[PDB]
Amino acid sequence: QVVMTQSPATLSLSPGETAAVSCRASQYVDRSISWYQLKTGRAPRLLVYAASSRSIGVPDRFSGSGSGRDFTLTIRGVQSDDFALYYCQQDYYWPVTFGQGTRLDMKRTVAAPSVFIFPPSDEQLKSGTASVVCLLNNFYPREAKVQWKVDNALQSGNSQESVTEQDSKDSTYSLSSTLTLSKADYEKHKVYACEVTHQGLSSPVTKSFNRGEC
Amino acid sequence: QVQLIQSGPQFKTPGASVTVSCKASGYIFTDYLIHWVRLVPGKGLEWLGRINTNAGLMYLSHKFEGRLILRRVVDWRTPSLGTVNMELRNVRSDDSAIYFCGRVVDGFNAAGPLEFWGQGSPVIVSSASTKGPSVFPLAPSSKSTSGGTAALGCLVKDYFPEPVTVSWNSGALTSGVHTFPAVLQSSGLYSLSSVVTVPSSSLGTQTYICNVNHKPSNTKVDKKVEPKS
Ligand SMILES: [Zn+2]
Ligand SMILES: [Zn+2]
Ligand SMILES: [Zn+2]
Ligand SMILES: [Zn+2]
Ligand SMILES: [Zn+2]
Ligand SMILES: [Zn+2]
Numbered sequence: 001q002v003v004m005t006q007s008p009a010t011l012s013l014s015p016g017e018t019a020a021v022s023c024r025a026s027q028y029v030d031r032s033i034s035w036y037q038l039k040t041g042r043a044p045r046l047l048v049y050a051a052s053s054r055s056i057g058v059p060d061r062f063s064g065s066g067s068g069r070d071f072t073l074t075i076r077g078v079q080s081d082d083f084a085l086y087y088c089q090q091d092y093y094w095p096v097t098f099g100q101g102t103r104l105d106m107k108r109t110v111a112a113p114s115v116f117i118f119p120p121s122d123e124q125l126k127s128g129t130a131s132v133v134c135l136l137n138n139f140y141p142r143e144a145k146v147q148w149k150v151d152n153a154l155q156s157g158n159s160q161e162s163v164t165e166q167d168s169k170d171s172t173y174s175l176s177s178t179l180t181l182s183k184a185d186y187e188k189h190k191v192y193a194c195e196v197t198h199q200g201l202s203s204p205v206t207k208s209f210n211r212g213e214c
Numbered sequence: 215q216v217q218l219i220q221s222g223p224q225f226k227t228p229g230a231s232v233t234v235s236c237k238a239s240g241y242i243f244t245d246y247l248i249h250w251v252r253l254v255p256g257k258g259l260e261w262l263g264r265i266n267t268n269a270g271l272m273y274l275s276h277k278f279e280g281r282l283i284l285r286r287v288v289d290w291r292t293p294s295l296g297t298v299n300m301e302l303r304n305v306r307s308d309d310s311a312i313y314f315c316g317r318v319v320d321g322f323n324a325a326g327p328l329e330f331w332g333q334g335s336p337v338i339v340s341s342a343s344t345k346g347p348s349v350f351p352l353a354p355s356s357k358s359t360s361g362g363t364a365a366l367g368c369l370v371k372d373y374f375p376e377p378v379t380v381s382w383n384s385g386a387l388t389s390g391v392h393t394f395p396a397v398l399q400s401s402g403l404y405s406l407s408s409v410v411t412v413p414s415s416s417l418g419t420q421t422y423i424c425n426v427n428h429k430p431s432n433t434k435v436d437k438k439v440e441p442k443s
Contacts (some may be wrong), residue, residue: 034327049327091326095275116365118352133352135409150432162394176394176407211356
């Protein structure tokens, strides 16, 4: 299949600056390239078709260049309405293929997260499950990593996390991670910790509790 | 003018078949190819195939030949109304996503730049029926220090289908709240969290309660969050 590589993965900017998403193709494709804007809970919006044709209803600040294997989407006067995901699409060969997508953020000062850990509650351990929850509150940039350790044993595969929309007033993010276990395995070990890595943190941050320590 | 209305969100158990109908309006139906694209939440976009609404022929990507069939019905009476249905057999974990319906720009029947989309049709594949959530408190642990500000919340666990609403203090408390996107568990049941940032002194002196409403199950619940000692 024709692979399409987008760059960058993220792109932070403030209103007014100009942006440039580029989409590389694994092989030549005349000018059969399209661009789509994508917002949460909304259908994809076509910005450009045939590599350079601006679609109707799309502002003149959107523009698409490129040809062969290097194509670009440009937004001169970036505006609040333009913060969203953008994807490139090739139709020179079937099957159609898209790029991984670019996230267009809103830049601000780096802000490290406030890290909180929550142990499983009274009520839930009588039901038969243990849910340890780790909160990373009001941080930026969006890229952040969480590792879970029990008795310092690195946990894998038994965790899920969620990230919120970029807040429209602090322009920050928040992240929730849930480590789910059996009540049997929860009562097996003592220390539960949530290691957090981010650009705004000198070194890894670790929040923990001791199972049963008052 | 142009409009593409799709099915409402559907919930199927593994191995079953799903059908997503898309009704086109506002243009000559037999003059444009309809395409189908899946949006999987974590990953990206996926092309499923395309149908020639005139002759009814079907073209699909290899990943789906033999598992999916596109069929169109042209309207008895008028050329500006038609419906295209999609049917995917033996659905599995990998198939949960928002299935979109769209038609090409005028003149691009041979390609696939899609100008007009349907609202989207979420189809979740889970081994589960409608269920009400269990709501557990989340508070800082017994010997937990949080310099400056502290946090608490509600874990809304094991519910199906989406969605739920989560307020705090019946609305009076809104500053610092973060309610997170639900996550679908390997159980086929949804789990969600809603936390709030609060001063360390206030913890233990103010009444904080989460107000949950899972309308699909008729479940309404209020839970007081309190740190223990
Ligand atoms: Zn050419
Ligand atoms: Zn214009
Ligand atoms: Zn979670
Ligand atoms: Zn264990
Ligand atoms: Zn580490
Ligand atoms: Zn907060």
